[PDB]
Structure 1
Amino acid sequence: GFKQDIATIRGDLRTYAQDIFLAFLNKYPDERRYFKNYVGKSDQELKSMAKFGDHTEKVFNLMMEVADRATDSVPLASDANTLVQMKQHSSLTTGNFEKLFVALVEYMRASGQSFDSQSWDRFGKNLVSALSSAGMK
């Protein structure tokens, strides 16, 4: 289930973080503009840029912490607040986050690795609701 999925992802965080992040940018190419250093780079090209590995690592580490602190795929109000208040997310709306989770769920469904994809969909919806409660437009 969801908790095991967190263990799956954490076990090979670099690979899953990079895979899912690329799935996100490739599914929603207009999202790439937020990451100006990734413009004009193929998947394999990004995988040798230090910042790309570091960014995806840090993002998915945090996402897993929020996931782990959730109850029944409902994230904590304080965690939603952390995500809204981050300077790096100041220009974002909840639509950006929906897109990420749609891509993430599609990735999991397409994987050969078992995942509780429905629970990640639910988590994404609940996080979107929490981001709104916390003041993201």
Structure 2
Amino acid sequence: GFKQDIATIRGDLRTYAQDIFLAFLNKYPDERRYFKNYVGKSDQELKSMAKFGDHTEKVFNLMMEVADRATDCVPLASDANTLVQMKQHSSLTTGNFEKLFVALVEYMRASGQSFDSQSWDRFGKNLVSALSSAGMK
């Protein structure tokens, strides 16, 4: 289930973080505009840039913390607030987060590995509601 999925992802965090992030950018290419230093760079070029592996792992580490602190896929409002008031997220809307979770779920469903993808979808919906409540447009 969802708790096992957190363990699966954490076990190989750098690989899953990179693969899911690239799945997100591939499905929604116009989203790459928010990551100016990744424009025009192939996947292998990205993975040789220190900040790409660092960014992505840290993003997914925080996502996994928020996921682990949730109850029945309902995140803490305090965690939603952290995400909204990060300077790096200042120009985002809940739609950018909905896109990430659509890509993450699609990726889970397409993988060899046995994810509770319904629960990630629900977590994503609950997180979007909470981001909105914490002031994200």
Same topology, TM > 0.5:
yes
SS of equivalent to 1:24: helix
The CA RMSD over aligned residues, in Å, is 0.3
Q: 2: distance between equivalents of 1:50 and 1:19?
A: 16
Unaligned runs of 5+ in 2: none
Alpha-carbon shift at residue 5 of structure 1 (Å): 0.2
Counterpart mapping for 1:36-115 below 5 A: 36-115=36-115
Cα offsets for 1:48-71 (capped at 9, x unmatched):
100000000100000000000000
Q: 1: distance between equivalents of 2:106 and 2:46?
A: 21
Q: 1: distance between equivalents of 2:62 and 2:95?
A: 19
Q: 2: distance between equivalents of 1:57 and 1:12?
A: 10
SS of equivalent to 2:135: coil
Alpha-carbon shift at residue 45 of structure 1 (Å): 1.1
Q: 1: distance between equivalents of 2:95 and 2:74?
A: 18
Q: 2: distance between equivalents of 1:45 and 1:124?
A: 30
Q: 1: distance between equivalents of 2:107 and 2:84?
A: 25
SS of equivalent to 2:66: helix
Cα offsets for 1:79-126 (capped at 9, x unmatched):
000000000000000000000000000000000000000000000000
Q: 1: distance between equivalents of 2:102 and 2:85?
A: 23
* TM-score for both structures, normalised by structure 2: 0.99
Q: 1: distance between equivalents of 2:103 and 2:19?
A: 10
Alpha-carbon shift at residue 35 of structure 1 (Å): 0.1
Alpha-carbon shift at residue 44 of structure 1 (Å): 1.2
Runs of at least 4 residues off by over 4 Å: none
SS of equivalent to 1:103: helix
SS of equivalent to 1:131: helix
Unaligned runs of 5+ in 1: none
Q: Identity of counterpart residues, as a percentage?
A: 99
* TM-score for both structures, normalised by structure 1: 0.99
